[PDB]
């Protein structure tokens, strides 16, 4: 029963606007930090924007700094996300995601498309694979810099958006099958599926929760044959 | 107050 329903996007020429917003229900709104998570074609998650419980505190990755303003209304329990100056860069499936020490539920992603460092680096290992069923599936994750244990695991299914597997390096959200195992801390982290089952293709992402900016690793695309 | 240290 919990839902966030995005809104919004659509095709724009460089330089003009959009407002998304994200409607959501389910869950009491004003007791979490919210935030907007963008994904270019073929191309990673990026966290953009997040915002505080009662909207006091924002807080904007560089790429979108000075463009783009988060705000929310607990009153509609809407969140929203004006984009001006929109650059061909831009142009992301955009999603909305509760945000706690991960991003618990995302939004179902909506597109924009536009057309006429100190921050800790995670990379993933290897970057796609094939298996068969029934076979041990290991994936790796790097910080460049320690993140303590504060490393999260999504897996998203192609056109749909991510669902979170472990956070914490180790702990299952509720209702992911026990075949799925994190473990590591400081720098080196690894996912693991015990037995590979038909429904466990996806693309399987990292990030961090250690440091502002959250940063992803650039996934694991996993086929099953 | 995880987030709230974390983000701002």
Same mark, same amino acid.
């Given at each position: 029963?919990v839902?966030?329903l995005?809104?919004?996007? $659509? !095709? ?13 229900? /389910? ?7 919210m ?6 074609? $073929?191309? %990673? ?20 700094? $000075? ?18 100056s !929109?650059? @061909? ?12 020490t991960a ?16 921050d800790?680096?995670? #990379? ?6 094939? @298996?068969?069923? %029934? ?6 994750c ?8 504060? !490393?999260?695991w999504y897996?998203?299914?192609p /056109? ?14 509720? $209702? ?10 400081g &720098?080196?982290?690894?996912? #693991?599926?015990?037995? !590979? ?5 996806? #693309? ?12 992803? /690793?650039?996934? &694991? ?5 | ?8």
């Amino acid at each position: 029963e919990v839902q966030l329903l995005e809104s919004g996007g $659509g !095709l724009v020429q460089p330089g003009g606007s959009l407002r998304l917003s994200c409607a959501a229900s /389910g869950f009491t709104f004003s007791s979490y930090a919210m935030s907007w998570v963008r994904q270019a074609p $073929g191309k %990673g998650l990026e966290w953009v924007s997040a915002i505080s419980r009662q909207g006091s505190k924002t807080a904007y990755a560089d790429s979108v700094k $000075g463009r783009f303003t988060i705000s929310r209304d607990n009153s509609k329990n809407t969140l929203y996300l004006q984009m001006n100056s !929109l650059r @061909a860069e831009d142009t992301a499936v955009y999603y909305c995601a509760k945000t706690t020490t991960a991003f618990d539920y995302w939004g179902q992603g909506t597109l924009v498309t536009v057309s006429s460092s100190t921050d800790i680096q995670m #990379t993933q290992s290897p970057s796609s694979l094939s @298996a068969s069923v %029934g076979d041990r599936v290991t994936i790796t994750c790097r910080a460049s810099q320690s993140i303590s244990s504060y !490393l999260n695991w999504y897996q998203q299914k192609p /056109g749909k958006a991510p669902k979170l597997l472990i956070y914490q390096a180790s702990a299952l959200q509720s $209702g992911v099958p026990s075949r799925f195992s994190g473990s590591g801390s400081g &720098t080196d982290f690894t996912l #693991t599926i015990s037995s !590979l089952q038909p429904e466990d293709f996806a #693309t399987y992402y990292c990030q961090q929760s250690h440091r502002r900016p959250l940063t992803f /690793g650039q996934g &694991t695309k996993v086929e099953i044959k | 107050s995880f987030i709230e240290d974390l983000l701002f």
